[PDB]
């Protein structure tokens, strides 16, 4: 019921996250921003180019093992 997601930043660095299919993705967003040392609202998180909301889940978005989330400046 868990999958690994690769979060890729503008500098091509990666942080991977193991998440549940049903978990709201706010916690991933907050954790990634924390590790970059920037406010969460300074970033936007995309899956297949579409914005990931705080209450989106991997299941809702159709995500699969080793799928990529891209992070851009807001």
């Amino acid at each position: 019921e868990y999958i690994k997601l690769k979060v890729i930043g503008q500098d091509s660095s990666e942080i991977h996250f193991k998440v549940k299919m049903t978990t709201h993705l706010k916690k991933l967003k907050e954790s990634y921003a924390q590790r970059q040392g920037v406010p969460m609202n300074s970033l936007r998180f995309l899956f297949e180019g579409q914005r990931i909301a705080d209450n989106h889940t991997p299941k809702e978005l159709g995500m699969e093992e080793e799928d990529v989330i891209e992070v851009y400046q807001e």
């Binding site: 660095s13 990666e14 996250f17 193991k18 549940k20 954790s31």
Partner: peptide, 10 residues
Amino acid sequence: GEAEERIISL
């Protein structure tokens, strides 16, 4: 300059 693997569990 190769980053190590980073996996965080939530």
